[PDB]
Amino acid sequence: RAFSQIKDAMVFAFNLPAIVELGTATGFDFELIDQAGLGHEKLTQARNQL
Amino acid sequence: WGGSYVNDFIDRGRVKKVYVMSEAKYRMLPDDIGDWYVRAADGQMVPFSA
């Protein structure tokens, strides 16, 4: 919190998980693939869509 | 008469090979080795049969 109230400088703080080197949060990890032609851009528009 | 691959261009985001070589029609029988000259140090174009 005390680090919110800071200039253009996102400054977070957080406690590391149990097993540093392991499967973190119950979250997900998704990966959007370029699967053809489509350049950076197209993927970006794609990414941004979703 | 034997291909040579200079280096790598890029095809829709997939690095690919690049090769210099003779159009088929100028490499098919021994009498074509008659077409290639080669610039000397005097700039005079000299031909193999030489």
Side-chain angles (χ1 to χ4, degrees):
Chain A
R1 269 77 63 52
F3 275 101
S4 82
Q5 283 331 276
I6 300 304
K7 39 157 303 117
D8 66 285
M10 257 160 262
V11 170
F12 283 148
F14 70 126
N15 186 325
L16 29 74
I19 347 224
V20 262
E21 230 69 19
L22 179 267
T24 162
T26 81
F28 61 61
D29 203 335
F30 191 91
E31 285 278 9
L32 210 75
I33 303 275
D34 176 11
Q35 217 124 196
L38 314 184
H40 192 69
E41 275 125 346
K42 287 172 117 179
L43 180 52
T44 302
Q45 281 106 65
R47 165 207 52 157
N48 279 9
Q49 220 147 112
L50 166 93
Chain B
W1 286 94
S4 170
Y5 56 118
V6 266
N7 57 29
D8 296 344
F9 88 98
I10 306 208
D11 210 336
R12 329 78 189 201
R14 159 96 165 168
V15 100
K16 322 249 276 308
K17 285 297 342 140
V18 195
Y19 285 105
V20 305
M21 197 168 78
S22 197
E23 197 171 44
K25 70 133 141 61
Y26 303 167
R27 38 167 199 92
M28 307 287 253
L29 341 146
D31 62 74
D32 301 333
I33 280 144
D35 300 304
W36 314 81
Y37 303 89
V38 177
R39 136 168 21 95
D42 71 323
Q44 178 79 64
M45 281 313 136
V46 26
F48 273 103
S49 57

